[PDB]
Amino acid sequence: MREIVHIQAGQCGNQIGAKFWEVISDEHGIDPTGSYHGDSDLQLERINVYYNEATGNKYVPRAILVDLEPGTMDSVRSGPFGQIFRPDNFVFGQSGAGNNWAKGHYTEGAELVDSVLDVVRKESESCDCLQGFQLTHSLGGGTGSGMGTLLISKIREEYPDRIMNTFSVMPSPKVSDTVVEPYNATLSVHQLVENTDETYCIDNEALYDICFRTLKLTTPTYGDLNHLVSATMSGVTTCLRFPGQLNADLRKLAVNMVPFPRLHFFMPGFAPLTSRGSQQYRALTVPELTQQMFDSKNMMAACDPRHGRYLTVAAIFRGRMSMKEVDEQMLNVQNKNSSYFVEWIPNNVKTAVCDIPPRGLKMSATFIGNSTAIQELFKRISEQFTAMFRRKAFLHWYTGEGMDEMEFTEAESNMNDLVSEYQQYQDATADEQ
Amino acid sequence: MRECISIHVGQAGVQIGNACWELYCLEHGIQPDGQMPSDKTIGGGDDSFNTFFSETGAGKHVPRAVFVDLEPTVIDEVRTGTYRQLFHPEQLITGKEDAANNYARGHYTIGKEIIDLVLDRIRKLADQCTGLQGFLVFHSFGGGTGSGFTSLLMERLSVDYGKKSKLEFSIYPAPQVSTAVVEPYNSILTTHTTLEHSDCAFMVDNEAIYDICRRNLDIERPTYTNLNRLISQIVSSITASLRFDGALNVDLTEFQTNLVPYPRIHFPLATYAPVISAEKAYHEQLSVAEITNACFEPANQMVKCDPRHGKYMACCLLYRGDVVPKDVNAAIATIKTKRSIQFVDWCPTGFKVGINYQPPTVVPGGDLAKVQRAVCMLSNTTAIAEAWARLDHKFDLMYAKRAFVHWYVGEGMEEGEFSEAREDMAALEKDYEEVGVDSVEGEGEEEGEEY
Amino acid sequence: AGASVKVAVRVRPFNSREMSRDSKCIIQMSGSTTTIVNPKQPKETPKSFSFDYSYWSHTSPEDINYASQKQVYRDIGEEMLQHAFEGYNVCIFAYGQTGAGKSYTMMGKQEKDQQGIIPQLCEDLFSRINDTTNDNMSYSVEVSYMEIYCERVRDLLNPKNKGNLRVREHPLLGPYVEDLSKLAVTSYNDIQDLMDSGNKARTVAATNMNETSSRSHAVFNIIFTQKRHDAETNITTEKVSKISLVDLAGSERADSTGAKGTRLKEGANINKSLTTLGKVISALAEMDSGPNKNKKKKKTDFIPYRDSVLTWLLRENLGGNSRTAMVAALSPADINYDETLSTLRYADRAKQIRCNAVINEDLNNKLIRELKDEVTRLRDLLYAQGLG
Numbered sequence A: 001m002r003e004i005v006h007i008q009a010g011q012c013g014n015q016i017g018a019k020f021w022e023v024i025s026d027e028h029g030i031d032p033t034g035s036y037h038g039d040s041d042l043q044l045e046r047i048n049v050y051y052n053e054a055t056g057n058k059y060v061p062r063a064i065l066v067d068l069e070p071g072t073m074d075s076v077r078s079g080p081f082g083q084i085f086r087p088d089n090f091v092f093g094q095s096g097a098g099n100n101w102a103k104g105h106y107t108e109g110a111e112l113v114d115s116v117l118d119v120v121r122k123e124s125e126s127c128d129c130l131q132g133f134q135l136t137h138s139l140g141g142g143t144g145s146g147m148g149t150l151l152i153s154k155i156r157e158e159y160p161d162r163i164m165n166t167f168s169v170m171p172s173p174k175v176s177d178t179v180v181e182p183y184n185a186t187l188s189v190h191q192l193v194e195n196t197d198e199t200y201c202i203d204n205e206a207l208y209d210i211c212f213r214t215l216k217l218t219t220p221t222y223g224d225l226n227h228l229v230s231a232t233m234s235g236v237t238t239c240l241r242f243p244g245q246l247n248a249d250l251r252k253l254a255v256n257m258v259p260f261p262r263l264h265f266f267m268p269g270f271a272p273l274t275s276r277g278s279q280q281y282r283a284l285t286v287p288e289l290t291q292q293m294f295d296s297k298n299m300m301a302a303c304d305p306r307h308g309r310y311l312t313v314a315a316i317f318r319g320r321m322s323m324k325e326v327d328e329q330m331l332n333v334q335n336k337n338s339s340y341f342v343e344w345i346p347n348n349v350k351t352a353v354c355d356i357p358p359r360g361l362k363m364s365a366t367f368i369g370n371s372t373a374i375q376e377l378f379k380r381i382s383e384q385f386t387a388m389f390r391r392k393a394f395l396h397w398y399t400g401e402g403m404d405e406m407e408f409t410e411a412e413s414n415m416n417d418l419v420s421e422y423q424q425y426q427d428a429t430a431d432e433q
Numbered sequence B: 001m002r003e004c005i006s007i008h009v010g011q012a013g014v015q016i017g018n019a020c021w022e023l024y025c026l027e028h029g030i031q032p033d034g035q036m037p038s039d040k041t042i043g044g045g046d047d048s049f050n051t052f053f054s055e056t057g058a059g060k061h062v063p064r065a066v067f068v069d070l071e072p073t074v075i076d077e078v079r080t081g082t083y084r085q086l087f088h089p090e091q092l093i094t095g096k097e098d099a100a101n102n103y104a105r106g107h108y109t110i111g112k113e114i115i116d117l118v119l120d121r122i123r124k125l126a127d128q129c130t131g132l133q134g135f136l137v138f139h140s141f142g143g144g145t146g147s148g149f150t151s152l153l154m155e156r157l158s159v160d161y162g163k164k165s166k167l168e169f170s171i172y173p174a175p176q177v178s179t180a181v182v183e184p185y186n187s188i189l190t191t192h193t194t195l196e197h198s199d200c201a202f203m204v205d206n207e208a209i210y211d212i213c214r215r216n217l218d219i220e221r222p223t224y225t226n227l228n229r230l231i232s233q234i235v236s237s238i239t240a241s242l243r244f245d246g247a248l249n250v251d252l253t254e255f256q257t258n259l260v261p262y263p264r265i266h267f268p269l270a271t272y273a274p275v276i277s278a279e280k281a282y283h284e285q286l287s288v289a290e291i292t293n294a295c296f297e298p299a300n301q302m303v304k305c306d307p308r309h310g311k312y313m314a315c316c317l318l319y320r321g322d323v324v325p326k327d328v329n330a331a332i333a334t335i336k337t338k339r340s341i342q343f344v345d346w347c348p349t350g351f352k353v354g355i356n357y358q359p360p361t362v363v364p365g366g367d368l369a370k371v372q373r374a375v376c377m378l379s380n381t382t383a384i385a386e387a388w389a390r391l392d393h394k395f396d397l398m399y400a401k402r403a404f405v406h407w408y409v410g411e412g413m414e415e416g417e418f419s420e421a422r423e424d425m426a427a428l429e430k431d432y433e434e435v436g437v438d439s440v441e442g443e444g445e446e447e448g449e450e451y
Numbered sequence C: 001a002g003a004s005v006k007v008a009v010r011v012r013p014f015n016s017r018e019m020s021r022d023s024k025c026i027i028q029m030s031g032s033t034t035t036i037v038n039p040k041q042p043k044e045t046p047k048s049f050s051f052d053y054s055y056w057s058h059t060s061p062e063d064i065n066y067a068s069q070k071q072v073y074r075d076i077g078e079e080m081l082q083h084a085f086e087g088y089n090v091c092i093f094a095y096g097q098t099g100a101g102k103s104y105t106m107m108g109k110q111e112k113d114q115q116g117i118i119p120q121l122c123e124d125l126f127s128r129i130n131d132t133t134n135d136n137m138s139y140s141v142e143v144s145y146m147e148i149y150c151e152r153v154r155d156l157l158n159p160k161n162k163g164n165l166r167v168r169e170h171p172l173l174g175p176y177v178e179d180l181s182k183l184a185v186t187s188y189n190d191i192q193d194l195m196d197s198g199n200k201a202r203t204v205a206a207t208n209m210n211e212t213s214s215r216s217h218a219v220f221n222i223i224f225t226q227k228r229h230d231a232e233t234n235i236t237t238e239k240v241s242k243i244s245l246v247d248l249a250g251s252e253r254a255d256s257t258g259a260k261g262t263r264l265k266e267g268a269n270i271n272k273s274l275t276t277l278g279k280v281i282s283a284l285a286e287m288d289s290g291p292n293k294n295k296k297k298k299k300t301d302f303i304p305y306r307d308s309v310l311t312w313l314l315r316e317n318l319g320g321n322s323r324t325a326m327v328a329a330l331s332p333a334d335i336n337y338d339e340t341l342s343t344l345r346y347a348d349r350a351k352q353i354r355c356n357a358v359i360n361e362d363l364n365n366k367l368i369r370e371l372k373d374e375v376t377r378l379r380d381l382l383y384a385q386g387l388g
């Protein structure tokens, strides 16, 4: 029996986790009080993937909420699904990291990490067959990025053979809510590239673009962003819980999509997405889902895939459908856009189909893409990093907590090396003289 | 007592087994619950045949099946499905992770600790069986448990049993269509085991079945259910000889004798002639000549390969229904008079013929039309190498840069296994190329009378 | 300049257990080619490989084409010591499964008539210097010894609590390890004593093959530095080079060693590290190829160095203006045939040159062919001259 332990660090991680748990509770028909009031029998067939059982037929999610600021904890508990979580799992401190990775990783988080790992170990020892972990957080922030990377390192030390997943919100080109985003993001990438099996790559820019141009929302808020992230986060693990014609475990995705150990940064996406009034003008078919999945504007990483080539992609479909349509459509996508796919992989489209659609839809699909174009994102951060590091713009706050410049140099070098392992396998090969 | 054991490994094997066992239950009149109202209504009979089903004192009939898979979900569907009472409670499910499209994981790491339990039941069935005829192993290339676990199981079965025939039904990767990136690695890796240990391997390709469904059956959007039903019909036609009476009955040993000229060329293609919808069932005669001609058409082959690019080493036709030997003889002669069908000069006979009286049955809710006659053809030819050649090409394109190798070597394998598998496949292709060559140009030395 | 690879494969004699048993030899070698026959398939057709050096130490008292220890040293170690004195890094990799001959190759025996690579290298290093020691030529030698186990670094010499050391990247000096004990040495005896103390601390495991097998790659780093006094008031460091001596663990298969738990984890990590290292060394040789072939290409490409800690720490020695050599040990016993073949498949790396077809016509048929050709030639001569 596969099952996953969920962790959420920082304000962004906590918000996305709250929306995710609301979505999953609705999918499985779990009341906010924890009781079950669903209809289908299949909902309980794999409830253990995300929940533990209590005495009174109540189901407690396997969540571990961590943050150094009690305000987000109070906001989460005073909410629609605040009471669902175990109170003992609300581990937190005071005197937040203050948008400082050094405080989050070396000074303030170093004390709370013991309690966090204690709760994680308690949840892990009761597992039947632990598959992997899922950490939701943001890299450009403070306590979130630092404590997330520290927990990743500790858990990978303790559980080397388990899959690790991280859904990270990075900085963006234009929208930037914090001054010191480059340093934090750089150190976070330095940790993540070394200590993670799969990383999913999202930024606020692409979510806003999706909300405005596709969903046509006049005044989007963080709820809608977290809703989209929850949709893809549920789609990625849909195959663990419900049956299907062709199953897809997390390990299957890891094996198919990671050609080499260091290239495990993915661009997610979700389909269908329509703006209410247009819903009656569209026909829901497999070609439409494929067209919207491979559309560049639907990508959630704000990296144009047309400025690069796909090393691998995965399509997790949900709903009743014909396998011939899926195979033909993916083959057509590979053949038509021949120049946008790496050529030394004969077929670079993993496909899986689950027979249970979402609650309110006849069909749905989740797209994942490992492509070179992601380099661009790293390059942007690198530029900003050097622009702040040549003059030592905001470095004294970091060095005051015990860090040194050599760590910054290491992180910059590691990102530069990663950017290359993506170009190497890009530009079409050629001859010489 | 012509009794065989059906083993199903992997998701593809399990779904194929579901379709097949539906077909056998319909054929023999056994209901899902496992009982047999036919005997109660009539009074008795041998319809509860020992070939697939074992009878107990309470009148219940249990199949001689062994379902195996690492994912709980695929067979947890079966335990909660229509046929929950048909099978034994034991279903041999590892409550652990899947092989993850990894031959090494399915063979070395997780394939252990289950191979014992599986082999123990494969015994409690063999010991219960008497006069065992053979094993029918269902799986699929390109999968983790469908490649590694099947390899380990075939190795252990060869070590233990040895002389019993082990027929293999498997799904090969298609030329264009695929549903995983690491299919070539698994398929090439398992080639050694399916070459050394299996006695005869019947191979199918999903693209060919999709084409047959689209063209002949007028199903614009097929699914795995229809392909599984077609494969089930193939297996039913194969095994119908040792269940029902017939003018000419063909056992498995005769399949091995006729379709295997040499030990390493035991890879015959298969096909089913009267694949036709109910609407097109009319306006057609479906005579013996028509089905015999349709068997040899390149379009109707179940593997995407052209027989016209190679020579036929051997052929075996199994007819079901109202068939009399005059028409099969005439059809064989008519086929022999055609130029496009080339036969190796060293096999002048080139045909095995079997006839059975029991006509094919129709699955309720299916798509095949009810017919009076049918034929299943097996064809050992040299065209199959072409398909293998395509697969070989893909492997090099993924092995030149050692992509996806760290996953395999992290579970127990080394690059030497990859090199050995590639060399073995190249040797097999060379053997297929050599055997298809004509006999020595007439060694007409023109010796003049006495030396 | 770049860095080329010298691949040498050597075969050892029998031991007491093999001599007592009636096992047959299976490795034939000639020139730069090594042929192996399957004991189980007498007609399997022999499999051949080709390397840069092919050493026949199978017959101990041999006098024709005998691969003496000093001969191998003159082939590899002397050239590497000369390159090191020039001020460029040199790396020596050892490979071979347990019972192959790695330890003999890297250490030698105590009678000092058949010495390993390291003793001869140390003796020549100390001698060459003691001679060049003038008034403006100061020399300094230091030694470090570490182990890599499950991608974690450990100090062998230090008796402290064997924790995991951290790996850092100095911007100019490249990768290095923090809190790694570094000691100076004065003679080969001190080096041998330090090596013995370190080897006693190595992580060793018992397998189905042998009760003592290496579970962790090891690195014995020799750092050599030269200070020059020119015709001036200043004494300046001329150059600093490194002689790296590594004991790469051997590859394996789960079938050969069916141990579960920790043993399988160690084997998986060793296989991953060896695959990565093979990738790096072959890719680094790819440079040679391409470069020499055309004459210029620039694009440094990207040689994967961060995929494993072993290749990361050995980055400076492997790449740049340096040299690397690879010595693989072979077992002659028939019973170990597959393992020997595996070593050959690992020894085929770092170039993958073409060994071509290997076959010999029957000697009787050779004589028949030669006699028929001679008869034809002599008959033609006699008929042309009119005497036949």
Ligand SMILES: CC(=O)O[C@H]1C(=O)[C@@]2(C)[C@H]([C@H](OC(=O)c3ccccc3)[C@]3(O)C[C@H](OC(=O)[C@H](O)[C@@H](NC(=O)c4ccccc4)c4ccccc4)C(C)=C1C3(C)C)[C@]1(OC(C)=O)CO[C@@H]1C[C@@H]2O
Binding pocket: A022, A023, A026, A027, A215, A224, A225, A227, A228, A230, A231, A234, A235, A272, A273, A274, A275, A276, A279, A358, A359, A360, A361
């Ligand atoms: C009733 C009906 O037919 O209308 C649809 C609808 O109009 C559309 C536009 C819905 C609608 O979604 C949105 O408007 C939306 C806004 C911001 C961010 C995300 C969504 C819908 O709200 C969303 C809602 O979706 C669901 O019910 C899914 O099960 C969804 N549910 C939740 O996320 C959820 C929300 C609140 C509380 C608990 C769960 C889901 C998706 C993936 C995985 C699990 C669940 C549906 C059917 C509709 C409305 C109501 C208008 C869409 O919803 C999704 C992502 O499934 C947006 O594009 C799709 C396609 C639909 O056509």
Ligand SMILES: Nc1nc2c(ncn2[C@@H]2O[C@H](COP(=O)(O)OP(=O)(O)OP(=O)(O)O)[C@@H](O)[C@H]2O)c(=O)[nH]1
Binding pocket: A245, A246, B009, B010, B011, B012, B013, B015, B016, B071, B098, B099, B100, B101, B102, B106, B139, B140, B141, B142, B143, B144, B145, B146, B171, B178, B179, B180, B206, B224, B225, B227, B228
């Ligand atoms: N014809 C047919 N093929 C199937 C079916 N299900 C899966 N397959 C084939 O199986 C291949 C994938 O490998 P599988 O054997 O299914 O993998 P698995 O059995 O789940 O084993 P793991 O990969 O280790 O989980 C695909 O290429 C499919 O074509 C089916 O129901 N019918």
Ligand SMILES: Nc1ncnc2c1ncn2[C@@H]1O[C@H](COP(=O)(O)OP(=O)(O)NP(=O)(O)O)[C@@H](O)[C@H]1O
Binding pocket: C011, C012, C013, C015, C057, C096, C097, C098, C099, C100, C101, C102, C103, C104, C105, C213, C214, C249, C250
């Ligand atoms: N050229 C040689 N001449 C004589 N004996 C040799 C020679 N090469 C190796 N040996 C023998 O090899 C043995 C030592 O090496 P051996 O123990 O086989 O390697 P190993 O240590 O087991 N492999 P590893 O543990 O991975 O380093 C001794 O018995 C030596 O006599």
Ligand SMILES: Nc1nc2c(ncn2[C@@H]2O[C@H](COP(=O)(O)OP(=O)(O)O)[C@@H](O)[C@H]2O)c(=O)[nH]1
Binding pocket: A009, A010, A011, A012, A013, A015, A097, A099, A138, A140, A141, A142, A143, A144, A145, A169, A171, A176, A177, A178, A204, A222, A223, A225, A226
């Ligand atoms: N999607 C989403 N992103 C958020 C939300 N709140 C903050 N962020 C992002 O997170 C970044 C700030 O990180 P923060 O949460 O303060 O890190 P922390 O203080 O360590 O927990 C900003 O750049 C925002 O883009 C939210 O509700 N939804």
Ligand SMILES: [Mg+2]
Binding pocket: A247, B010, B011, B070, B071, B098, B145
């Ligand atoms: Mg499976």
